[PDB]
Paper text:
[name] is a 210-amino-acid transcription factor that binds cAMP generated by adenylyl cyclase in response to the phosphorylated form of Enzyme IIAGlc (phosphorylated in response to the phosphoenolpyruvate-carbohydrate phosphotransferase system). cAMP-bound [name] regulates the transcription of over 100 genes crucial for carbon utilization through its binding to a specific promoter region and recruitment of RNA polymerase. Previous studies of the ligand binding domain of [name] demonstrated negative cooperativity between cAMP binding sites in the absence of structural change within this domain. We demonstrate experimentally that altered connectivity between backbone elements in [name] can give predictable alterations to cooperativity for cAMP binding through altered mode amplitudes.
We examined amino acids predicted to show altered (V132, H160) or neutral (V140) responses to altered amino acid side chain interactions. High-resolution X-ray crystal structures of [name] mutants V132A and [name] demonstrated that these variants possessed decreased and increased hydrophobic interactions across the dimer interface, respectively. Comparison of variant crystal structures with wild-type demonstrated that there was no statistically significant change in structure. Cooperativity for cAMP binding was studied by isothermal titration calorimetry (ITC) for wild-type, V132A, and [name] proteins to examine whether the experimentally observed changes in cooperativity matched computational predictions.
Residue numbers in the entry:
A (entry chain A): 6 to 209
B (entry chain B): 9 to 209
Write the structure that this text describes.
């Protein structure tokens, strides 16, 4: 189901706010004191390497918590930027108020922690993929994963997505021009087709 | 610490010699662990069995937590004792009951999951754009940046073999060997013995 009494009980203690596409909701390095929850829309989580190249860590969607990593220890800073990808409606609540809720009904912490565990798995797998997959394998895996994001439109030949070469590069950790060359190959190999800011993935 | 005591008194604690596999990747997850004493390595590997260490965990760390929140999860990684270990253990089902009495125990587990997410994301962002040379270089450069470093005429000095490097980055032993040799021939490092001087800093 989309939601449930526990989530709605939780949401009743929150203020829900709207953000236009491309808003930065969370800035890296700032003090964390607030927990968020996506009621509609999607965001990208961003970090940088030591040279200041931007990497897209994750997409997060409706039903996902954000800003949860500061909850657990005093005086923590936001680990990453979070930017709207889509017009967003986002519930929000102070860590203070959320800690009470946790005592009232620990399941709400269970819900949150299920997401942190999944994130650690997913993020660990990407790490492994740096070393175990080659760049072509990583782009291809990325196309496969994008293909089952909840925003992926349906098509006679498989899932259609919309993403720039730039964005694919930032997800995988390679340049825009490398993505360019590789997509060209992939479709010349009739595994995908790519006309527009928009790509059809066969199978999925 | 009243809460850890309480939690431990509901576990069974066992001893494992250095080098035991505590957790096997792919196996069905139903049990939670907690390191009472000792250190462990958390590892993944490809179809060739190139290993990559995701992390070390130490005394006071939970392990095998990631299957707790959904039925029928498999273990995401191998976990291997690095020293001799004393490891407490508890069924997920009984850990769920403890969480009902005192959610603070889940606060402590989740705090660690958050620290691990932060560390692992950092490594990903820091390595993703590098090739295997970059990643071996940065690794060396980072040990020059830690406490275990001696000084030198030419720069910082470090101890570590080719296996150990292969693990930080994900690559074979022969590949590390080739790249250390290149780096040496390009006079960025010296391999005097099976230790390494990193020229700079
Ligand atoms: N590896 C990741 N995967 C998914 N989301 C993340 C990841 N790293 C950080 N975030 C999110 O981005 C947020 C940045 O602010 P916090 O660290 O408070 O909480 C963080 C998480 O909600
Ligand atoms: N990136 C990581 N950092 C630290 N520990 C991890 C990481 N990935 C997996 N683990 C630990 O390794 C365990 C393997 O079994 P589980 O997936 O049950 O729980 C996992 C975590 O306890």
């Amino acid at each position: 189901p989309q939601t449930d009494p526990t989530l709605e009980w939780f949401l009743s203690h929150c203020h829900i706010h709207k953000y236009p596409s491309k808003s930065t909701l969370i800035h890296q390095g700032e003090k964390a004191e607030t927990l968020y929850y996506i009621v509609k829309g999607s965001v990208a989580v961003l970090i940088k390497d030591e040279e200041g190249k931007e990497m897209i860590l994750s997409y997060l969607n409706q039903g996902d918590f954000i800003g949860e990593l500061g909850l657990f220890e005093e005086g923590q800073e936001r680990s990453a930027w979070v930017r709207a990808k889509t017009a967003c409606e986002v519930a929000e609540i102070s860590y203070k108020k959320f800690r009470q809720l946790i005592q009232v009904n620990p399941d709400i912490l269970m819900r949150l922690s299920a997401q942190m565990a999944r994130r650690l798995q997913v993020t660990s797998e990407k790490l492994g993929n740096l070393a175990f997959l080659d760049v072509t394998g990583r782009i291809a895996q990325t196309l496969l994963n994008l293909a089952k994001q909840p925003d992926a439109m349906t098509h006679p030949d498989g899932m259609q997505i919309k993403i720039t070469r730039q964005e694919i590069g930032q997800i995988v950790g390679c340049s825009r021009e490398t993505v360019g060359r590789i997509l060209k190959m992939l479709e010349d190999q009739n595994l995908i087709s790519a006309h527009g800011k928009t790509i059809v993935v066969y199978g999925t």
